[PDB]
Structures are given as C-alpha cells and as structure tokens.
Amino acid sequence: NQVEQSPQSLIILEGKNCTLQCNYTVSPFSNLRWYKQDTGRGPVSLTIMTFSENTKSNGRYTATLDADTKQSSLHITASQLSDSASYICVVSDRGSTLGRLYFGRGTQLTVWPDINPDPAVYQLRDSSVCLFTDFDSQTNVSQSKSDVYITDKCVLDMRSMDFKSNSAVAWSDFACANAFNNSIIPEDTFFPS
Amino acid sequence: DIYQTPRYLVIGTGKKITLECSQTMGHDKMYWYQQDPGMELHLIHYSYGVNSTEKGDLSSESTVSRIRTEHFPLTLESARPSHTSQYLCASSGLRDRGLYEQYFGPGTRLTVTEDLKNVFPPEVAVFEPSEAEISHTQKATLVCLATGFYPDHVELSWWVNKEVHSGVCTDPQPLKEQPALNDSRYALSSRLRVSATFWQNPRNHFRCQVQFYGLSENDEWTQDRAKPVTQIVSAEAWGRA
Amino acid sequence: FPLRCLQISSFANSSWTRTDGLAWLGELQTHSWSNDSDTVRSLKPWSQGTFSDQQWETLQHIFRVYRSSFTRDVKEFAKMLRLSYPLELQVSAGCEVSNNFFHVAFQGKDILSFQGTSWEPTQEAPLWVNLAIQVLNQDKWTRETVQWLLNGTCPQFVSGLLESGKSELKKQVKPKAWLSRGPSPGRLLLVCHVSGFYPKPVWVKWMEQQGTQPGDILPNADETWYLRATLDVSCRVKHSSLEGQDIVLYWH
Amino acid sequence: IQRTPKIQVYSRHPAENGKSNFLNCYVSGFHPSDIEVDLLKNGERIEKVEHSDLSFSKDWSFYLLYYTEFTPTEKDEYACRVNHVTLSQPKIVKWDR
Ligand SMILES: CCCCC/C=C/C/C=C\CCCCCCCCCC(=O)N[C@@H](CO[C@H]1O[C@H](CO)[C@H](O)[C@H](O)[C@H]1O)[C@H](O)[C@H](O)CCCCCCCCCCCCCC
Ligand SMILES: *[C@@H]1O[C@H](CO)[C@@H](O)[C@H](O)[C@H]1NC(C)=O
Ligand SMILES: *[C@@H]1O[C@H](CO)[C@@H](O)[C@H](O)[C@H]1NC(C)=O
Ligand SMILES: [Mg+2]
C-alpha cells in the first residue's frame, strides 16, 4: 500500500468542520484526486490537483496539497448530515492515461445531529411496533440477544419546522418497556399505557 | 455519460452473469472495479480501447470484452456465493481542465443464491402514530415496515397525496430476519414525521412505496407461485382527528 | 561539435530489462550511465561543464526518474500494442551550437521523434505508432520538459562543455604509417596501414590510381583512430596533425 | 535478428616479436545488441580483456571494441570470436601478422 489515509473512520456532529488526511509514497507524482462515495453509489470527483497547486475549492470542500511532504488534506466546511460518506484519495503517477492509479482505503465519515432532547418510547398500531425517539447522539442502540429485531439510530430532518431527530423502531407478548433492554437508555425516559 | 444497467441484479448460481457498461463520450480508457460493502476498491479489469483487455489487481474469474469503444461488458463464466459484490465501471478522459480524469459508473449490486425459489417479494405494512407523541411532542411519526424479502435489493420512498423527502429517514442497510442461514430474508424501516395538525387532517393520503428488484422474463420457474418480478408493494394511510 | 545523448534499452522478456546510456561531444565520448549505476559517471574531468554542482544534481535526478519511467512505459506499450518481446529501442537526443533533435527508433528502425512542441511519427512508420503518439501527447508536463531541456538547457550546457575542456578537443596527434603484404588475390595485395591519428578526418589513397579501396576508420583504446587502405595489383597520407607533410611511403 | 556483425582485428602499433602492443577487436553494424565477443590466444580466450561502452551509429546498428595488452611472438596465434543471433555458430576472425 503506497497511499495511506487517516483517520480510518470518524464520527462528528453537524455544523462542525473536520480535516481528513492522505499520505502517499507514490513516485513520480503527477496529479491527485479526492472522491466522495455515498453508501450504495459510485465515487464523485470532488477535486483534482497537481504538485504546483496546493488549494482547490468545491464550494464547501477544500483540499490542499503539501507537495513537499507528500500529503494532502480535505477540509469539509460546515459539515451537514449529507456529508456522511466515504472519502477516497487516489494518486496517479503519470500525466497521460498510461499510468497506474493508487487508491487509498478511504476515510469513513459519519455526521450526527447536535441535539432539546425528549427521549420517549411510544407504541404504534398496525394497518405491533415500538419507537425509540428524540434522544441525543450519545445514545446508542444495541442489537438482539433470537426472534427480537431492533434497528440502528437514524436521523430525520423536518426542514419545514427546522427540526432534526433520531429514531429506532423495534418489533417482535413483546412489551415496549422491555424492548431496548440490551441497549442503554436514559433515566429520563417516557413510557405510556 | 457512463451508464450501468441494471442497478440491481439477482441471479442463481451456476449460471452466467453479464454486466452492461456503456458510455457516449469517445473515451478509449475504461475500468472495472469490485467493492464489498465497507471495504475498498480493487481493480479487476481495464482497457486501453477496442480488443485491448487487461487483468487488474485481483485475479477474478470475471472476463471482459471491449469490441466497441462505447461498450465494456463484464462476464462471469459461472456464478458462486463468493462472487456476490458490487461492480463499478469507470472511464478516463479529458475533462474541464487539461488533465485526464476518471468518471465512475452508477454501479450494479449483485446477489448470487443457491436456488431462485429463495427470492421473495417484500411485505409492507404502514403503522399509525401514537397519542402520547402528539400529547408530549405535538408531532406525529408514521412508520413503514417492509419485511420478508430476498435479496436485499429494495428502494423505499414516502408518497404523500407525491413523493416526499423532508421529515423522512430510512435504514442504511436491511436487517436479516434469520441470522443463521447463509441466505436469509430481510426487512427495512422508514419513518415519516410531519406535524400533528397535518396528520390530524383527514384530507391527507399517505402511501409507502417499496421498489423491489427481482426476476425477469428470461428467468425460469418450477413452482406453484407468481414469479417475484420487479414489482412495487405498498400500504396506504389517511389522516385522523 | 554536436552533443549526442545516446540510449540503448533492451527488454529480453516481460521481467528482464537493461537501459544504458552515453554522451558524445563530437567524436569524443564525455559521459557514461549503466543500468546498475544509481548515478551518472564522469569520464573526463570536465563532464560537469560550467553547470553548478547544485544544478548537476538536478540533471542527475531528472534522468533517474526518466529511466524508471521509460522502462515501465515501454513495458506497458508492449501490452497495449500486443508487441512481442524482445524489444529494442534506441534514443538519439542532443543538439548543437542552435537546432536540436530527438529521434527514437524501434528494432533499429525510426518510428517517431520530437518535432515542434510534441511527438510526430516518421514517414515509413507502422500504423500502430499513431497509437503511441496519441498517448505520448497526453502527458503535458513531459512535453514541455523536453522543450525545457532541448531549446534552453542543452544549448546552454554544450556551451559550458566546449569551454571547460577545449584543450582536449583541439588536441592534435601526429600518426605513423607502414606498408604490408596482403593475401594474393599473379595479382598481389598492397596494404597501407595508418594508425594513431587525431581527429577522425583523414585522407589516404594509393597515389591516384582508380582502384584504391580506403577501408573504414577503426578506433583505438587511446581515443585515436586506425586506417587500412588497400590496392589490388606509393601511398599518400594527408592529415591535420602533420601540416602539409603528406606521409608518402614508397614500395617496396 | 536483422543486421549481422562485422569483425575487424588489428594492433595499435606495428607488431614486433618481443615488443608490447595492443590487440584490438572491433565489431559493428549488428542488430540487436546482445552479443558475445572474446579475444582468443592459441584457441583459448583471454580473461583480462577490457572493452568500451556499447554504442550505435546513425543507422541504428551497434558497434563495440574489445582490447587487451599483449606481446606478440612468433609462435603465438590470436583471434577474435563473436556470437550473434544472426549466426548459426560463433564466427572467428584471426589476426594476420
Ligand atoms: C549529458 C550526460 C548524458 C549521459 C547519457 C545520457 C543519455 C540520454 C539518453 C536519453 C535522454 C532522454 C531525455 C531525458 C528525459 C527528458 C524528459 C523526461 C520526462 C520524463 O521523465 N517523463 C516520464 C516521467 O513523467 C511523469 O512524471 C512527471 C513528474 O515526475 C510528471 O508527473 C509527468 O506528467 C509524468 O508522466 C514519463 O513517464 C515519460 O513517459 C517517460 C518516457 C517518455 C520519453 C520519450 C519516450 C519516447 C517513446 C518511447 C516508446 C515508444 C513506443 C514503445 C513501444
Ligand atoms: C527473461 O530473460 C532473462 C535473460 O534471458 C532470463 O534469464 C529470464 O529467465 C527470462 N524470464 C522469462 C519470464 O523467461
Ligand atoms: C536493471 O536495473 C534494475 C534495478 O534498477 C534491475 O531490477 C534490473 O534487473 C536490471 N537489469 C539487469 C541487471 O540486467
Ligand atoms: Mg478515440
């Protein structure tokens, strides 16, 4: 592996800006790209630079190119939820199509909401099902122990009322007051009748 | 300008899979990568133009054929449960600057099974909000649950009266109903959360469309069941005060 | 006195290569470079010319990158064009004091060169060379960098060379000659041997009888030359070293 | 497997029995460049033989020089053996005294 790339994975809150790194030992060096890969889609080229340059901007994306110490970093500005993806840094070693391409393993980026938290577990009727909701990023949901099924955290944004919340539906005699027993829960939780 | 069809493709073992990759722009340089969900990108094939086909990093059983400049199909001589992955096509060519950049294809998810009878259409059931949620938070959360399907090739969107995206989230990846079997059925969960008022108005129609990708016309069938073709299953919902 | 930068690359098979190079300032070689040498060797104590020591390392670095790149590039062109090993490319770069030139040849035949601002194939070149040119001309940085060396660097360098080490260039050496008997073709074989002269230009004839066969000019270890003139049946020799003195040898 | 070598053997100075001299073997006009050149003495090849850097001419064919220090005598025979792809068997030119 000639193209290292740190950090492996990271989790940040929305609104903040982070800096992803990419160190290559590829020589000779011609150009270097950065790709953004959503889960399920293909790489979309953010930028591309040569050694003479050291700063390019794609709106909220700004890669730099330390050509002397052979590294380059992508600075995601004002990170929103839509930036949760993989960030792949590939370096070519020629100026034509006669070169090799060196792909780093990428950096996994997760963006969480900065949560007025009112955690509560409701119960929903069919057309049963439970609902963990309205907690903060620090709260995490565990999986099953057999016939019990529980989902992960998921973030929805009501851009209408400018509101963002987490959620975690669970289903399966199964009571909603015992569903998330394998998962940690705040002592300030609501339970109905 | 690089297309890939189909986006999803379920097939049985032993058979021959063939992935379509095409392009309009006149680029002679095209690539083939393989990626596992969470892992990286490995080169399996590339091409400098017509009749030129080269083996990449991994020595895959896959073979490619570049006979037209605009096409670059990939072929598996005989499928196997380990050849289940995602296959991305790419192409180098002169872009906006004076450099030769790479454009990536949309992608094609592939799932190899042991028997095509294991393919099951999705089952959708729309759940209705809680009165405690409307009393404590003055908001309403609807829940769509598509369960018991195979493979994990499922697209979900919330149709209101019109497909919406705001106040909506869905599972990043489906969860298997049976953690043991190497070929298990799956389930998914989306969420719709509008205001209490919007939900309490009975002049509103809520529908949860689940796009399932399944068998085609060329596929065989030996049983007393309807072939799980690329169909849509859903469940409706109306407001209530 | 042209500066010729030569290069011979041999590719036995996919995984065995060698690329060695040398430099001729006129009839006299000035540098050397082997596949197993991480640097370039200096033969004459003035192969650095007038170029600074903080710049001679720049030329050293450039050629190092060029060597490993050229080798991988030909290896890859071999795959693309289905060319079958072995492959033999020579490269004749250089200039003089100021038109320059950059001719490459494949299996001893001209296929292309660097005319203008990019690569242009030769007249009787095969069709598949167009494929090479189309790809060679994609590399922008390389195309200008050849210009940066051919139109500006190299002409400034040969100036520095021709100054630092001109005593060895106008160096004159008087030769010596002797006559011998060659294998009788009643015909005999008169042979006029000449050796040790400097520089290469020479005139030797059997005066002039219209049957003299002045052979090739063969080199000696001491950077001098050797000439064998024959006649099938005196001998006259004029050289720059011996001014006006025509080395006439009488038979027998 | 195109152009075939051309071997020419000669001495620096006029060879005199008992006086040191230089034996020269010049091979040229061959292609491709892989070639085996050895200076023979009485049938056996000389081991301490120095040569020059392989080079080519205007017509893209290669030339070369092998040489060594030697003292010619009346009984000693010398030759220059060459092996190329254009040859079925290694050709040998002797040095005429
Ligand atoms: C005076 C002392 C003399 C000592 C003996 C000297 C002998 C000299 C013999 C030959 C000299 C040749 C000229 C020297 C090299 C001058 C040009 C060098 C350009 C070069 O190295 N370029 C490198 C590096 O470039 C890379 O890396 C760069 C950054 O490091 C940039 O990123 C570039 O974009 C990137 O591509 C490229 O990889 C080139 O591809 C190198 C090969 C091209 C040279 C010409 C080839 C001619 C055709 C041969 C093949 C024909 C078909 C065969 C089937
Ligand atoms: C390539 O050629 C070299 C020299 O002839 C030889 O030693 C080596 O084994 C060869 N490799 C192959 C793959 O034949
Ligand atoms: C030439 O040099 C490279 C390393 O610089 C080496 O791997 C290659 O085998 C060499 N060719 C020879 C020694 O014949
Ligand atoms: Mg074309």
Tab-separated table of N, CA, C and O in Angstrom, chain A residues 1-3 24-33 35 48 89-104, chain B residues 29 31 33 41 43 46 48 54-58 92 100 102, chain C residues 68-69 71-73 75-77 79-80 135 138-139:
chain	number	residue	atom	x	y	z
A	1	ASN	N	0.815	-1.212	0.000
A	1	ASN	CA	0.000	0.000	0.000
A	1	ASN	C	0.853	1.269	0.000
A	1	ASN	O	1.574	1.541	0.957
A	2	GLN	N	0.771	2.039	-1.080
A	2	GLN	CA	1.567	3.253	-1.204
A	2	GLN	C	0.798	4.495	-0.761
A	2	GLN	O	1.401	5.483	-0.347
A	3	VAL	N	-0.530	4.441	-0.843
A	3	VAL	CA	-1.370	5.559	-0.419
A	3	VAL	C	-2.068	5.296	0.918
A	3	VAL	O	-3.132	4.673	0.968
A	24	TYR	N	0.813	9.827	0.713
A	24	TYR	CA	1.210	8.918	-0.365
A	24	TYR	C	2.733	8.786	-0.475
A	24	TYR	O	3.469	9.732	-0.196
A	25	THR	N	3.204	7.610	-0.879
A	25	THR	CA	4.630	7.414	-1.137
A	25	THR	C	4.853	7.102	-2.610
A	25	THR	O	5.904	6.585	-2.997
A	26	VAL	N	3.848	7.420	-3.421
A	26	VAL	CA	3.894	7.199	-4.861
A	26	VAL	C	4.843	8.174	-5.557
A	26	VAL	O	4.785	9.379	-5.321
A	27	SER	N	5.718	7.652	-6.410
A	27	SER	CA	6.600	8.493	-7.210
A	27	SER	C	6.928	7.853	-8.564
A	27	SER	O	7.201	6.654	-8.636
A	28	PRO	N	6.923	8.658	-9.642
A	28	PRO	CA	6.740	10.113	-9.615
A	28	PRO	C	5.276	10.536	-9.467
A	28	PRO	O	4.361	9.775	-9.790
A	29	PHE	N	5.072	11.750	-8.966
A	29	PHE	CA	3.736	12.271	-8.723
A	29	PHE	C	3.325	13.257	-9.808
A	29	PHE	O	4.059	14.200	-10.116
A	30	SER	N	2.149	13.031	-10.390
A	30	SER	CA	1.579	13.969	-11.352
A	30	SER	C	0.366	14.694	-10.776
A	30	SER	O	0.423	15.897	-10.508
A	31	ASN	N	-0.729	13.961	-10.598
A	31	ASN	CA	-1.940	14.541	-10.027
A	31	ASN	C	-2.489	13.730	-8.855
A	31	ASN	O	-2.024	12.621	-8.584
A	32	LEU	N	-3.467	14.304	-8.158
A	32	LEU	CA	-4.090	13.669	-7.003
A	32	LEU	C	-5.545	14.089	-6.930
A	32	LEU	O	-5.868	15.265	-7.068
A	33	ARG	N	-6.423	13.118	-6.711
A	33	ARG	CA	-7.851	13.388	-6.638
A	33	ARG	C	-8.420	13.077	-5.261
A	33	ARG	O	-7.770	12.450	-4.421
A	35	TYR	N	-12.293	11.658	-3.924
A	35	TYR	CA	-13.640	11.243	-4.303
A	35	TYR	C	-14.562	11.157	-3.094
A	35	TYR	O	-14.112	10.889	-1.983
A	48	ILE	N	-9.232	17.790	-7.966
A	48	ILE	CA	-8.065	17.159	-8.562
A	48	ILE	C	-6.954	18.196	-8.701
A	48	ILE	O	-7.174	19.279	-9.241
A	89	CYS	N	-9.071	8.915	-1.582
A	89	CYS	CA	-7.984	9.736	-2.093
A	89	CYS	C	-7.081	8.912	-2.991
A	89	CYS	O	-6.355	8.038	-2.511
A	90	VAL	N	-7.128	9.191	-4.290
A	90	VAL	CA	-6.333	8.442	-5.259
A	90	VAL	C	-5.311	9.310	-5.993
A	90	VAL	O	-5.604	10.434	-6.406
A	91	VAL	N	-4.106	8.763	-6.134
A	91	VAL	CA	-2.985	9.453	-6.750
A	91	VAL	C	-2.562	8.758	-8.036
A	91	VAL	O	-2.279	7.566	-8.029
A	92	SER	N	-2.509	9.494	-9.139
A	92	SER	CA	-1.951	8.950	-10.376
A	92	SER	C	-0.452	9.233	-10.457
A	92	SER	O	0.047	10.148	-9.809
A	93	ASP	N	0.263	8.453	-11.260
A	93	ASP	CA	1.715	8.593	-11.352
A	93	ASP	C	2.190	8.976	-12.752
A	93	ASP	O	3.375	8.863	-13.059
A	94	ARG	N	1.259	9.414	-13.594
A	94	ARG	CA	1.580	9.882	-14.939
A	94	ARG	C	0.684	11.054	-15.303
A	94	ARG	O	-0.270	11.358	-14.593
A	95	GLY	N	0.982	11.696	-16.426
A	95	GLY	CA	0.176	12.798	-16.914
A	95	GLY	C	-0.678	12.386	-18.096
A	95	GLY	O	-1.379	13.207	-18.678
A	96	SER	N	-0.606	11.107	-18.452
A	96	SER	CA	-1.423	10.543	-19.521
A	96	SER	C	-2.306	9.442	-18.962
A	96	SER	O	-2.469	9.325	-17.749
A	97	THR	N	-2.877	8.635	-19.849
A	97	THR	CA	-3.692	7.501	-19.434
A	97	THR	C	-2.845	6.240	-19.434
A	97	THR	O	-3.369	5.126	-19.467
A	98	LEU	N	-1.528	6.429	-19.398
A	98	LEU	CA	-0.586	5.322	-19.432
A	98	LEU	C	-0.094	5.003	-18.027
A	98	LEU	O	0.816	4.194	-17.844
A	99	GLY	N	-0.700	5.638	-17.031
A	99	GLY	CA	-0.250	5.485	-15.659
A	99	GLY	C	-1.038	4.492	-14.834
A	99	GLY	O	-2.057	3.951	-15.279
A	100	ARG	N	-0.551	4.238	-13.624
A	100	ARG	CA	-1.300	3.450	-12.662
A	100	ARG	C	-2.060	4.410	-11.769
A	100	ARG	O	-1.690	5.580	-11.647
A	101	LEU	N	-3.139	3.925	-11.171
A	101	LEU	CA	-3.882	4.712	-10.205
A	101	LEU	C	-3.751	4.045	-8.849
A	101	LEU	O	-3.903	2.831	-8.735
A	102	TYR	N	-3.458	4.832	-7.821
A	102	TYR	CA	-3.290	4.284	-6.481
A	102	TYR	C	-4.382	4.791	-5.548
A	102	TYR	O	-4.420	5.972	-5.204
A	103	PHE	N	-5.267	3.883	-5.146
A	103	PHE	CA	-6.410	4.223	-4.308
A	103	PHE	C	-6.111	3.947	-2.850
A	103	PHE	O	-5.645	2.866	-2.505
A	104	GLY	N	-6.381	4.925	-1.996
A	104	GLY	CA	-6.325	4.704	-0.567
A	104	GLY	C	-7.590	3.984	-0.149
A	104	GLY	O	-8.573	4.001	-0.884
B	29	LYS	N	-10.280	4.727	-22.693
B	29	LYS	CA	-9.829	4.148	-21.429
B	29	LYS	C	-10.977	3.888	-20.453
B	29	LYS	O	-11.620	4.828	-19.984
B	31	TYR	N	-12.484	1.154	-17.046
B	31	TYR	CA	-12.065	0.300	-15.933
B	31	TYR	C	-13.190	-0.568	-15.368
B	31	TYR	O	-14.371	-0.304	-15.594
B	33	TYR	N	-14.036	-2.201	-11.441
B	33	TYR	CA	-13.671	-2.403	-10.046
B	33	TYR	C	-14.663	-3.307	-9.324
B	33	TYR	O	-15.805	-3.456	-9.746
B	41	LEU	N	-11.765	-0.447	-3.022
B	41	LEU	CA	-11.921	-0.703	-4.445
B	41	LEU	C	-10.725	-1.458	-5.013
B	41	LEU	O	-9.592	-0.985	-4.937
B	43	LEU	N	-9.065	-3.270	-8.488
B	43	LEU	CA	-9.113	-3.339	-9.946
B	43	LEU	C	-9.194	-4.790	-10.398
B	43	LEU	O	-8.387	-5.619	-9.981
B	46	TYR	N	-9.191	-3.648	-16.921
B	46	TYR	CA	-9.178	-2.364	-17.621
B	46	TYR	C	-8.946	-2.533	-19.118
B	46	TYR	O	-8.721	-3.640	-19.600
B	48	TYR	N	-7.528	-0.270	-22.841
B	48	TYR	CA	-6.980	0.918	-23.499
B	48	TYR	C	-7.741	1.269	-24.774
B	48	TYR	O	-7.358	2.182	-25.499
B	54	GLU	N	-7.192	-6.045	-20.233
B	54	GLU	CA	-6.127	-6.409	-19.310
B	54	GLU	C	-6.665	-6.834	-17.945
B	54	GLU	O	-7.709	-6.358	-17.500
B	55	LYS	N	-5.936	-7.728	-17.284
B	55	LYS	CA	-6.269	-8.152	-15.928
B	55	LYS	C	-5.710	-7.160	-14.909
B	55	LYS	O	-4.597	-6.659	-15.063
B	56	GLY	N	-6.486	-6.882	-13.868
B	56	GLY	CA	-6.105	-5.891	-12.880
B	56	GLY	C	-5.440	-6.480	-11.653
B	56	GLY	O	-4.714	-7.470	-11.748
B	57	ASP	N	-5.693	-5.863	-10.498
B	57	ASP	CA	-5.109	-6.296	-9.229
B	57	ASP	C	-5.499	-7.733	-8.896
B	57	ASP	O	-4.673	-8.644	-8.979
B	58	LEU	N	-6.760	-7.928	-8.524
B	58	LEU	CA	-7.267	-9.250	-8.176
B	58	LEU	C	-7.463	-10.121	-9.414
B	58	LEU	O	-7.967	-9.659	-10.440
B	92	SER	N	-11.512	7.043	-18.040
B	92	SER	CA	-10.618	8.195	-18.035
B	92	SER	C	-10.780	8.981	-19.329
B	92	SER	O	-10.998	8.393	-20.386
B	100	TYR	N	-6.533	14.247	-17.431
B	100	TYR	CA	-7.376	13.118	-17.801
B	100	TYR	C	-8.022	12.493	-16.568
B	100	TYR	O	-7.421	11.665	-15.885
B	102	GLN	N	-11.207	10.674	-14.146
B	102	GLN	CA	-11.963	9.437	-14.143
B	102	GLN	C	-13.411	9.686	-13.732
B	102	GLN	O	-13.678	10.275	-12.683
C	68	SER	N	13.389	5.011	-14.939
C	68	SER	CA	12.447	4.058	-14.366
C	68	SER	C	11.072	4.232	-14.990
C	68	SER	O	10.266	3.302	-15.024
C	69	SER	N	10.805	5.434	-15.482
C	69	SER	CA	9.528	5.714	-16.110
C	69	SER	C	9.509	5.130	-17.512
C	69	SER	O	8.545	4.467	-17.897
C	71	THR	N	11.180	2.708	-18.688
C	71	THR	CA	11.158	1.253	-18.653
C	71	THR	C	9.757	0.725	-18.409
C	71	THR	O	9.331	-0.223	-19.060
C	72	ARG	N	9.032	1.340	-17.479
C	72	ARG	CA	7.665	0.912	-17.213
C	72	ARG	C	6.735	1.261	-18.376
C	72	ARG	O	5.804	0.514	-18.681
C	73	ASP	N	6.998	2.393	-19.026
C	73	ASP	CA	6.178	2.851	-20.146
C	73	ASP	C	6.253	1.913	-21.354
C	73	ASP	O	5.233	1.615	-21.974
C	75	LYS	N	7.191	-1.254	-21.209
C	75	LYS	CA	6.573	-2.481	-20.717
C	75	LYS	C	5.059	-2.446	-20.896
C	75	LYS	O	4.443	-3.470	-21.180
C	76	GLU	N	4.469	-1.265	-20.741
C	76	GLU	CA	3.015	-1.105	-20.819
C	76	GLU	C	2.526	-0.953	-22.259
C	76	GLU	O	1.442	-1.425	-22.605
C	77	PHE	N	3.327	-0.289	-23.089
C	77	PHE	CA	3.035	-0.169	-24.512
C	77	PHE	C	3.083	-1.538	-25.170
C	77	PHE	O	2.392	-1.787	-26.151
C	79	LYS	N	2.069	-4.308	-23.824
C	79	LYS	CA	0.777	-4.928	-23.533
C	79	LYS	C	-0.308	-4.376	-24.448
C	79	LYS	O	-1.101	-5.126	-25.018
C	80	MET	N	-0.334	-3.054	-24.573
C	80	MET	CA	-1.347	-2.360	-25.355
C	80	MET	C	-1.302	-2.732	-26.830
C	80	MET	O	-2.318	-3.088	-27.420
C	135	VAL	N	-1.036	8.892	-27.190
C	135	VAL	CA	-0.941	8.749	-25.736
C	135	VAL	C	0.265	9.499	-25.173
C	135	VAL	O	0.204	10.061	-24.080
C	138	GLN	N	-0.515	13.122	-24.531
C	138	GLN	CA	-1.449	13.455	-23.462
C	138	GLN	C	-0.690	14.053	-22.285
C	138	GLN	O	-1.176	14.969	-21.619
C	139	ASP	N	0.504	13.521	-22.033
C	139	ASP	CA	1.349	14.000	-20.952
C	139	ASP	C	1.817	15.409	-21.284
C	139	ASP	O	2.714	15.599	-22.101
